[PDB]
Structure formats: structure tokens, C-alpha cells
Design a protein around this ligand. Sequence first.
Ligand code: ATP
Ligand code: ATP
Ligand code: ATP
Ligand code: NAG
Ligand code: NAG
Ligand code: NAG
Ligand code: NAG
Ligand code: NAG
Ligand code: NAG
Ligand code: NAG
Ligand code: NAG
Ligand code: NAG
Ligand code: MG
Ligand code: MG
Ligand code: MG
Lengths: 326, 326, 326
Amino acid sequence: VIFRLIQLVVLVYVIGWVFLYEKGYQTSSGLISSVSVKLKGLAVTQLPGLGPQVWDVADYVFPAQGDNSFVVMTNFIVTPKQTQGYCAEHPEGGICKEDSGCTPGKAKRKAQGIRTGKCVAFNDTVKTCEIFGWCPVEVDDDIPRPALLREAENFTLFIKNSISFPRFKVNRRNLVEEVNAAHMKTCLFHKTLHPLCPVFQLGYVVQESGQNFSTLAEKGGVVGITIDWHCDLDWHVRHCRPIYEFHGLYEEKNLSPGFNFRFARHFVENGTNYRHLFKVFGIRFDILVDGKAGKFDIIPTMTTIGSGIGIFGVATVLCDLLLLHI
Amino acid sequence: VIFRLIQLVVLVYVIGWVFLYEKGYQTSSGLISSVSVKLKGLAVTQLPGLGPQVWDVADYVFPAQGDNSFVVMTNFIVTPKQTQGYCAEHPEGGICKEDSGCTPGKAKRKAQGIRTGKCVAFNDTVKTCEIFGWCPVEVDDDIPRPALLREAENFTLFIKNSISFPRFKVNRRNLVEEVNAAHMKTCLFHKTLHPLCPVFQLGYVVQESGQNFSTLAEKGGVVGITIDWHCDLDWHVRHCRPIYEFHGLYEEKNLSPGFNFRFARHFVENGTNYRHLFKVFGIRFDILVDGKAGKFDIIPTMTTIGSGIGIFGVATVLCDLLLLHI
Amino acid sequence: VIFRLIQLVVLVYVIGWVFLYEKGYQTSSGLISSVSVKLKGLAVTQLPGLGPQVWDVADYVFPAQGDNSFVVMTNFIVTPKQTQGYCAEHPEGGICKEDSGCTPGKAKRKAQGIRTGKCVAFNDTVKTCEIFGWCPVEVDDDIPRPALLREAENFTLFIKNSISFPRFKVNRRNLVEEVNAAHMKTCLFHKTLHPLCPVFQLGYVVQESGQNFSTLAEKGGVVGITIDWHCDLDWHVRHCRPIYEFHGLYEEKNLSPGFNFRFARHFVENGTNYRHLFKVFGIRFDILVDGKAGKFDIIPTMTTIGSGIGIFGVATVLCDLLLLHI
Ligand SMILES: Nc1ncnc2c1ncn2[C@@H]1O[C@H](COP(=O)(O)OP(=O)(O)OP(=O)(O)O)[C@@H](O)[C@H]1O
Ligand SMILES: Nc1ncnc2c1ncn2[C@@H]1O[C@H](COP(=O)(O)OP(=O)(O)OP(=O)(O)O)[C@@H](O)[C@H]1O
Ligand SMILES: Nc1ncnc2c1ncn2[C@@H]1O[C@H](COP(=O)(O)OP(=O)(O)OP(=O)(O)O)[C@@H](O)[C@H]1O
Ligand SMILES: *[C@@H]1O[C@H](CO)[C@@H](O)[C@H](O)[C@H]1NC(C)=O
Ligand SMILES: *[C@@H]1O[C@H](CO)[C@@H](O)[C@H](O)[C@H]1NC(C)=O
Ligand SMILES: *[C@@H]1O[C@H](CO)[C@@H](O)[C@H](O)[C@H]1NC(C)=O
Ligand SMILES: *[C@@H]1O[C@H](CO)[C@@H](O)[C@H](O)[C@H]1NC(C)=O
Ligand SMILES: *[C@@H]1O[C@H](CO)[C@@H](O)[C@H](O)[C@H]1NC(C)=O
Ligand SMILES: *[C@@H]1O[C@H](CO)[C@@H](O)[C@H](O)[C@H]1NC(C)=O
Ligand SMILES: *[C@@H]1O[C@H](CO)[C@@H](O)[C@H](O)[C@H]1NC(C)=O
Ligand SMILES: *[C@@H]1O[C@H](CO)[C@@H](O)[C@H](O)[C@H]1NC(C)=O
Ligand SMILES: *[C@@H]1O[C@H](CO)[C@@H](O)[C@H](O)[C@H]1NC(C)=O
Ligand SMILES: [Mg+2]
Ligand SMILES: [Mg+2]
Ligand SMILES: [Mg+2]
């Protein structure tokens, strides 16, 4: 009788686990995703010598059109009115005492310009090789300790994620039926309180990634936002909801901490070409959307049943051999 | 004799389905893809007060260098010569009667600037809190009903998709051998007539995604272009061709319809910093390239044969048990 | 005795191959990746009529903030001070003898502007239809044979790849423990000599992709950089290292060789709107990061053991049938 008992255990396993837990009766399809991101919020940076400068979405989001991976500027160093000319290079490229030390040409690594070959004063104490390039050279030694856009903590990120399961011809948007005009007006995403609001406060996103916004704001950082669409299309499509998880690890001990990049805003003034060089420290938000849809299909159902019978057949042989040797 | 009959059925299944349909004799490798997109076409927008403005690829493609996900501008709202200053904020941030209602600071959500705390006239009828920020504030209430770049319907998208199967060291470009200089000159992609022309008319792409370009043009939209490379490398490499499928669902009832973003073109005029704010309504084309290559390999062939023998062994046991109990 | 001999062979197979080589005792999880790219190096282009122009990271990287897919400019054609006006279109849009040939409107394909309908002289020998658009029209017929930014060969690409295995809560950066401040100062990645230095010389990357930088520099190109994280988390996390492989095939015979795009730098001079049109020929670097982590888990271990017993049970039946029929 114990022989058939195992058969029931195998039958329970197949039905309970393979046929039900793993949804063996369902076929699976990946998704194709499109992510639209809009940032709302504004930061003001009043440099002691420069009047209050405002930074809206058009100025602190890179790229402006948005992408799966986009950068929100949280701190910057600006070299205003850079012009192509001769000037002393940054001392990070070497410090010279006389023109003999400087060699005409271009530095082998991290070149700042075309070295003329004569030493010139970078400042009163330090003399550096004269280069041809964007002048004055960028001085990014002093990152602002309170991030100039630390107010980006309260910026709101609206993630509009349109997914499709092409095999099942099911289109879903992360703005699920629950999300309405009233929610989009005042809702801020919370992992438990508002798990479906597609408006994310950047500080909350960074905090839920296991990171500190104040630390990430100063020198930039990385936050990974995963949107998971695990949907059972055998149920009403309204249950096909996204799951948001935030990822990131900022170790100050780790070398090259944070994220930064340089971009320039070229302009012409007084019939001369100038540019504003910005070393933008910012949090790169990588929005990775993954998921699978499961819809009942007869072909996986039959193969799962066939696999269950095959498992049953193997188990009966194993029980037969077991009883013989024991 | 029925015992061996089932054996043939299992043998037919293994050979016919596992060994041939599923190509069990082949090993499989994913692909690494690079997508190059070039947009050709031009739109002219003659505002009643502003002379005819032309929009070529450098101006309506975001990003200009292109990407797997890029935006073609189909409609825009422009705030010309925005300057950082004091002005009335947009009424969407609140309408005030007196300065008492306004509070100095920054709005908690969708902040437009630094509220000075005194109510000022946004226009004759409506007074809004004075803010410091980009002035005049954007008025995006009236989206142009005929899209300013509705001529983007006839824009041509050239998708240059270079894929590689690194395991098989096979490199393919969507410009297949069939595609030649004469085709690239006049061909427009059609799902059946010209299924290999890599030049796609945007209107056709939107139409084949199940969407209406006129609707998507006004408020933006999303079109997913999937390039599938299902190649059997046992055949000549010339048969490794891409398959293009277009995806998208635009529901006007759905909240936040379409896609839009704001970008600015900063410039200096009369020794003052200005910017042109554009609320760009556009169709975000997400080009997702997937696929797998199958090349004959002895190791999968042996395992498939071994699996077939294993299936044969299980089937014989099942037939044995069947005949006993029946 | 040969019966049990096969049992050992199956036991060796399960333990040796399934349980050990394929790490059946381990569960597997994909990774979520964020790629930060910084380009260092400078190129100078001294046009015979235009003074030496320098190109630093802010000017030759598209997008400036970087992405998984980014473009490093290696050659460009510039149309300076384009303004919206009437002028002769490029002869690629058609050559006319009289105004009768030109038709007012817009060309059906590759439109350059709004044709006024009167033929005008493009140059002394050739007359083309007058259009309204960006003037003077781009003349990209003569790509510079020595690429203007062929010095991009010695540009250094710093790939900062932060990955996470969310199931295992393991965060890794391609700046592995071996990589320190001293390495990041002077190291250049080599496939064998320095396989962990995250600073890549562009010439080396193109060369290791099977391509010639001089060829790719002139007309652009594509290089795929794959970062593979195949990590066994049963071992210390310091062994979770990335593997870099470079992919690309440049066939001059292939149609549409290379990669190029057009972007504009709009500016206002003398109270008039102008733009600098750049046809940027560049190498698009697609950084695809993939990999899987394997950590010992009891559930895969039991199923692998159960599968091994199942394989053992099937093998015993096959040996039984074999001995009967033979
Ligand atoms: N592409 C590159 N080639 C060579 N060195 C690089 C490159 N990118 C960064 N580095 C160097 O690596 C170190 C850390 O890089 P990281 O970008 O995090 O620092 P940083 O202080 O912002 O650098 P920098 O101001 O030099 O761009 C610095 O010494 C930086 O100069
Ligand atoms: N990041 C965000 N934070 C908060 N609200 C947002 C955000 N992005 C969009 N919204 C709001 O969500 C609603 C719909 O968003 P959507 O971007 O589709 O509309 P819109 O009319 O283009 O918005 P807007 O002009 O305010 O950017 C609007 O009320 C908009 O203000
Ligand atoms: N979107 C498009 N629609 C139509 N033709 C296109 C498109 N993109 C490129 N082409 C044409 O395809 C051919 C090769 O394309 P490719 O971009 O490699 O060449 P090109 O010389 O840089 O082109 P162009 O200067 O015309 O942009 C050219 O004749 C080009 O005009
Ligand atoms: C001069 O420059 C060096 C290197 O950047 C810096 O350490 C030093 O403090 C500077 N001195 C002054 C007086 O600014
Ligand atoms: C964000 O939270 C509130 C705004 O409602 C404010 O009190 C706080 O200071 C803000 N923090 C920053 C860093 O701007
Ligand atoms: C973040 O860092 C700041 C300063 O480094 C510190 O005051 C604060 O307690 C940290 N944590 C949070 C949650 O802000
Ligand atoms: C004033 O602004 C409000 C809010 O934008 C608008 O509804 C109204 O039509 C405007 N009135 C005039 C006369 O422009
Ligand atoms: C696109 O098709 C033709 C151009 O050949 C033209 O008749 C039609 O009006 C165009 N449509 C738009 C919206 O520009
Ligand atoms: C698209 O919409 C327009 C106006 O909304 C309508 O006239 C047209 O019939 C629709 N369909 C197509 C295919 O253009
Ligand atoms: C005139 O333009 C045509 C077409 O671009 C070109 O082939 C020819 O060489 C040009 N002639 C001169 C004198 O520039
Ligand atoms: C790159 O290599 C060295 C620089 O160290 C130089 O001799 C060589 O000419 C450079 N090549 C180019 C194309 O700039
Ligand atoms: C690359 O091309 C140039 C010119 O086309 C040639 O001189 C050189 O030998 C080629 N190979 C390498 C490795 O530079
Ligand atoms: Mg620095
Ligand atoms: Mg609005
Ligand atoms: Mg051309």
C-alpha cells in the first residue's frame, strides 16, 4: 500500500507544485517595455557671487527626453565662459618649475590641451605647463559639500511604463486602473502605502535603494529602479500590476565613488565662441523593466501532464528498485 | 504489436518534434545588437506671428545621435526667450486673491519657482503667486490640435541594426544582401511587399503598431519596433534575416495619454542668459532587438538523442504499467 | 557486473557534470547593471581656414552623460552658421536646368526643405531647386580622409559598471578590489596583461573588436563591449570579476558603412537664429552587461539529486531493456 502512497505524493507534487505553483498549464512570454520619465521639482543655487539660478526639469535631467537610464543632476561644478585659448593647465596634469620640464605636444593620459611647452603660472604658488584648449581650465578639486541641488531629494519622478506581451497581445501601463487623475495629483509612491503611484520622490527612491541622498547628492550616485510585471493573464488584466524595487550600493571607501560627467553649453557672445562647462554630479536612475505573462494554453498543459506521467513512471521504477534491494 | 507501435510514435515525436521542429541537434546563442537610426524628412511650422520654421533631423530627433529608444518630435509648445526672473506662476500651481494666500518658499509638488509670497496677476482674470524662475512661465494648456509636426508621418526612419552572435562568431546587419544601393534609394518598408527594406516611414510604423498617427502626433505616443533575428546557421548566412514587428496601444481614455518632455536651448543675447523651452510631444520609438542563432553542434545532438532514449525508456515503462493494470 | 558499471557512469555523470560542472547545487540569478562611461583625451582639428579647434569629452561624446550605447566622435563635417532661409538645395535632391523642372512643395524622400519651385545655381556648374530651410545646405560629399578626430584612437574610456544580483543581494563594481588608486592612474586595459583595468584605450578596444580604427575613424563604426559577470557566490565575493569582450565587423563592401548622425548647436548672433550643423562620424560603443550569479541553495541541490536519481532510474530501465533484447 506504501507503493501507491508514494504515487499520491508524486501526484500531489505534480499537481500541487508543477501544475499549480509553477503554473505548468500556462505558457510564458516576455515583455517589451517603453519607459517614459518626467521629473518635477525645482532647485535654486545662489552662488555668493552669482544671483539665484533656478534648475528645472529641462536643466537637471540628462537626457532631457528621458530614457531607461537617465541622470538627475544633484551637484555641479561650472566653469563659465570657457574659450579656446592658451592658459595654464590644471596641476593634476603635472607641475613644472621651468619651461624645460614642459614638452610641446599632448599629454599621454587625461590630456587637457595641446601643451605649448613653456611653463606658466596656474596660480601664485603653482606653475603648470601652458596648453591650448578650453580656458580657463576646469578646477573641480572642491566639490560643494552641501550639494547645490540637494533639493533634488524632493523632486518627483513620474515613471510612465508602457509594456506589451506581444505573444498574448496584452498591453499594460504602470498607470494601472487604480491610479486615477486624483491620485496622480497628490500621490507619492510608497512601498506599502501607495505601491502603485507612478510618481516617485527621488529622496524616497534613493532611501529605498539602501542609500543616503545627502551622500549621493554631493558626488553623484546610481539607483536602479526595477519594474517587474509578473502577470497571470488567466486572471482579469486589472491584476497585471507592476512591482517597483530600488537598488544601489554607495561605499565611500570604494574607489571612484558616485557618478559624474561633463557637458558643455556652447554659445556665441561678442562674436566669439564660448562654452559653459558643467561637471554634473548626479544620480543615474537605471529603470530596468522585466517580467513575464502567464496565460493558460493547452500545449503546456498537455506537456506538463505528460511530464507528470513521466515523473510518475520514473517514480514507480524507483520504488520498484527500492523494494527489491530493500 | 501495439507496444512497438507506441515506440514508433515516441520515435516520431522525438525525431519529428524534438530533434527537428525544436532543432534539438542545434546549440543556441543570443545576440548582441547595436541599432543605428537616421531620420529623414522635414517639417515646416509657420506660426501666424512667426515666419516659417523648418525642422530637420537635427531638431526633431531626441537624442540626435539616436539610440534603441529615441523620440521623434511630432508636436511642440515653445516658450521663447525664457529668462530667470520674477513673474506670475502658472495657475496650475494655485490661484490667489491676495498676497496673504501666497507663502514665500517653494511649492511641495510640481514647483515652478521660488514663490516670493506676493500675489500677482497671471493675466487679467487670474492672479497667481509670484515666483522666481524661468519667465514667462510655460503655458502648455493649448496643445495644437493639428500637430505642428504632423508631417512627421512621412518622415523616413532608417534602422541600421548590426547584430553579432558571439558564440558562433557570426555578424549580421539588417541591411541584408537583398538590400542594395538601388533599394536604399527608393524603398519604403512594407510588412509584405518590402519586408527587408530598412527605411521605415513613420506613418506606416505607427499604423502597423495599431495606432493612428494623427492622434499620436498631437500629444505624443509610444511605438515599439522589435527586430527579431531567428536564424538557422546550418543554412547559408544570407538567410539570417531580421523580422520587424511594430507595437503600441494608444487609449485616449487612459490617463496621461501620449509622451512629452521639456528641453531647453540656452543662449546668450544682449549679455543676458535666455533659453527656449520646448514641451516636445513626440513618438518614442523603442527599438528592441532580440533573437537567437541555431547552429548544429554534436553535444546538443547527443543530449537530444539521450533525451529521446530516456523518453523512450519512460514510455516503455508507462506502456508496461498500462498493460498490467489494463 | 556491467549493470552496476553503467550505474557508476551515470553516477559520475550526475555528480561530475550535472552536480559539479553545471553547478546544479546552485540557484542562478541574473543581474541588473548600470554603466557609467567617462572619456578622457583631446583632439585638435586645425582647418586650413579655421584656427585650431580642441575637442574634449564634453564635445565628442554623445550623449555627454553617457549611456550603455554612446558615440565617440571620430570624424565630422560641419556646416557653420546655418540659418533658415532660401538657398539652393544639395544636388543629391535633384539637378534642374530651368524653373519648370522644379515643383513647389517638399520632396517625397530625403527632403532638404520647402522647394520654392524655381531653379537656382547650387554652384557654377550645377543648378538645384531653391528650397527654404537651413542655409547654406550641408555638403557632406567629401568625408575627410584622415579623420579629424583620428586622435580618438588614444582616447581613454573609463567604464564604471555597477551590477547587482538582487536575489542574492550582492553588489559588484567592475572596479574590483585589485583595481586601486595607483592602477586607475596609469593602467590601460589589456586582454591578458591588465584584464581588470576599467580604463580602455579606444584604439585598443576597436583593435580587439577585429576592426581598424583608421577605417572606423573616417566614416564611423560600431564596437560592442560586453561585460560578463559569471560569478560563483559560494566563493569569496572578490572573485566576482567582469570579463570584457569587444565585438564589431566593418566591411567596406557592405552598404551604408559606418555610423554617422547630424546634430545642431543652435545659437543667436546679431539678433538672428543660427545653428552649427555637424555630421558626426563616430564609433558607437554599445556596452552590454550580462551575467549570472550562482550561490549554493538546498532546493536546487535536492532537485538536482532527484534528477540524478531519476536519470539513474531511467538508465537502469534502459540497461534492463538492452540486456533483454541483447
Ligand atoms: N577615461 C578615463 N581615462 C583615464 N582616467 C580616467 C578616466 N575617467 C576617469 N579617470 C580617472 O579616474 C579617477 C576616478 O574617476 P572619476 O571619474 O570617478 O573621478 P573624478 O575626480 O570625477 O575625475 P575627473 O575630474 O578626472 O574626470 C580620477 O583620477 C580620474 O581622473
Ligand atoms: N514627475 C511628476 N511629478 C508629479 N506630477 C507629475 C509628474 N510628471 C507628470 N505629472 C503630472 O501628471 C499628470 C499627467 O502627466 P503628463 O506628463 O502626461 O501630463 P502633462 O500635461 O504633459 O504634464 P505637465 O505639463 O504638468 O508636465 C499632470 O497633471 C502632470 O502635471
Ligand atoms: N531615414 C532615411 N530615409 C531615407 N534614406 C536614408 C535614410 N537614412 C539614410 N538614408 C540613405 O541611405 C544611404 C546610406 O545611409 P547612410 O546614413 O549610411 O549614408 P550617408 O552618406 O551618411 O547619408 P546622408 O548624408 O544622406 O544622411 C544614403 O543614400 C542616405 O541618403
Ligand atoms: C593653487 O593651485 C593648487 C593646485 O590646484 C592649490 O592646491 C592651491 O591651493 C592654489 N593656491 C591658491 C592660492 O589658490
Ligand atoms: C524636502 O522636504 C521638505 C519639503 O516639503 C523640506 O522641509 C526639506 O527641507 C526638503 N529637503 C531638501 C534637501 O530640500
Ligand atoms: C546622510 O548623511 C548625512 C550627512 O552625511 C547625515 O546627517 C544623515 O544622518 C545621513 N542619513 C540620512 C538618512 O540622511
Ligand atoms: C487667464 O489664464 C487662465 C488660466 O490659464 C485662463 O483660463 C484664461 O482663459 C486666461 N484669460 C485670458 C484673457 O487670457
Ligand atoms: C504625407 O503623404 C503625402 C506626401 O507624399 C502628402 O500628400 C500627405 O499630405 C502627407 N501627410 C502629411 C500629414 O504630411
Ligand atoms: C485618425 O484620426 C483622425 C482625426 O482624429 C481621423 O480623421 C482619421 O480617420 C483617423 N484614422 C486614420 C487612419 O487616419
Ligand atoms: C558643384 O557641385 C557638384 C555637386 O555637388 C560637384 O560635383 C561639383 O564638383 C561642384 N563644382 C564646383 C566648381 O564646386
Ligand atoms: C597615439 O599613440 C601615440 C600617443 O602616445 C602617438 O605616437 C600616435 O601618433 C597616436 N595616434 C594618433 C592617431 O593620434
Ligand atoms: C588600417 O588602415 C590603414 C589605412 O587604411 C592602414 O595603413 C593600416 O595598416 C590598417 N591597419 C592598422 C592596424 O592600422
Ligand atoms: Mg577632476
Ligand atoms: Mg502642463
Ligand atoms: Mg550625405
